[PDB]
Amino acid sequence: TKGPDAASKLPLVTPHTQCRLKLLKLERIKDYLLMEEEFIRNQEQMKPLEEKQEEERSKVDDLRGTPMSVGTLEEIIDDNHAIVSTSVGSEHYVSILSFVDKDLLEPGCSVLLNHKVHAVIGVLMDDTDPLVTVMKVEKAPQETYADIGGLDNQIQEIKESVELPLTHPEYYEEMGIKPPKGVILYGPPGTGKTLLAKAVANQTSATFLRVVGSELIQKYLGDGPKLVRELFRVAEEHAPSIVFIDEIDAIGTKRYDSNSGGEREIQRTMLELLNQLDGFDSRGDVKVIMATNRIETLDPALIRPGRIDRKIEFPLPDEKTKKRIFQIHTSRMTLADDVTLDDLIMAKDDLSGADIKAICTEAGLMALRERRMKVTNEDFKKSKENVLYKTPEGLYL
Partner 1 sequence: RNDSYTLHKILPNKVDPLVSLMMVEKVPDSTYEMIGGLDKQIKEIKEVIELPVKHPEL
Partner 2 sequence: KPIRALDEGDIALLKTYGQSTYSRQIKQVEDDIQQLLKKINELTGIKESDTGLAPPALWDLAADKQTLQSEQPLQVARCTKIINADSEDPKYIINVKQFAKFVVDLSDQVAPTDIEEGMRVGVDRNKYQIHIPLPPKIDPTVTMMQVEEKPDVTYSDVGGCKEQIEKLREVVETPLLHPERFVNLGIEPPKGVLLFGPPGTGKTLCARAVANRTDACFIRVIGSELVQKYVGEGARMVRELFEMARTKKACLIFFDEIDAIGGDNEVQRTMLELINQLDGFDPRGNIKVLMATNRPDTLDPALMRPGRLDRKIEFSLPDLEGRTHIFKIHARSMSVERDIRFELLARLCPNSTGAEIRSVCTEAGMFAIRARRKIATEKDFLEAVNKVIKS
Ligand X SMILES: Nc1ncnc2c1ncn2[C@@H]1O[C@H](COP(=O)(O)OP(=O)(O)OP(=O)(O)O)[C@@H](O)[C@H]1O
> Residues annotated as binding site for ATP?
187-194
What is the Cα Rg of the chain in Å?
Answer: 27
Q: State the nearest-atom distance from the C-beta of 358 to partner 1, in Å.
A: 11
Contact region for partner 2 (CB under 8 A) — 55-63, 184-192, 207-215, 349-357? 55-63
345 lies in the site for ligand X, by CB under 6 A: no
HSE-CB for 78 with a 13 A CA cutoff: 0
- For residue 207, give the 3-state DSSP assignment: strand
Sheet of strand 241-246: strand arrangement: 207-211, 241-246, 286-292, 183-186, 310-313
d(CA 123, CA 119): 11
Q: Are 209 and 246 a contacting pair, CB within 8 Å?
A: no
Closer to partner 2 by Cβ: residue 335 or 351: 335
Number of chain positions touching partner 2 (CB under 8 A): 82
Q: Which of residues 358-377 bind partner 1 (CB under 8 A)?
A: 365, 368, 373
Residues 168-207: x/- map of binding to Mg ion (CB under 5 A)? Answer: -------------------------xx-------------
CA distances from 383 to 316, 328, 360, 369, 376 (A): 20, 18, 8, 12, 11
Note whether 18 binds partner 1 by CB under 8 A: no
Angle formed by the axes of helices 377-387 and 353-369, nearest 10°:
120
Among 84, 96, 148, 274, binds ligand X (CB under 6 A): 148
Identify what 33 binds: Mg ion, partner 2, partner 1, none; CB under 5 to 8 Å per kind.
partner 2
42, 126, 263, 316, 390 from 215: Cα distances, Å: 42, 21, 16, 28, 33
Considering CB distances under 5 to 8 angstroms, the limit depending on partner class, which of ligand X, Mg ion, partner 2, none binds residue 151? ligand X
The answer to whether residue 63 forms part of the interface with partner 1 (CB under 8 A) is no
Our CB check for partner 1 shows the closer of 34 and 368 to be 368
Interhelix angle for 261-279 vs 223-237, to 10°? 20
Site track 254-293 with ligand X (rule: CB under 6 A), x = hit: -------------------------------------x-x
* Dist CA 198 CA 141 (whole Å): 6
354 is a site residue for ligand X (CB under 6 A):
yes
Note whether 325 binds ligand X by CB under 6 A: yes
Beta carbon nearer to Mg ion, 194 or 276 = 194
Residues of span 1-30 touching partner 2 by CB under 8 A: 9, 17-20, 22-23, 26-27, 29-30
Tell which residue, 143, 149, 240, 239, has the closest CA to residue 194. 143
Residue of closest CB approach to ligand X: 353
Nearest CA-CA partner of 380 in 316, 328, 331, 326: 326
Using the rule CB under 8 A, is 176 a contact of partner 2? yes
Q: How far apart are CA 32 and CA 6, in angstroms?
A: 20
CB of 126 to partner 2, least distance (A): 5
Asked if 112 is part of the footprint of partner 2 (rule: CB under 8 A), the reply reads yes
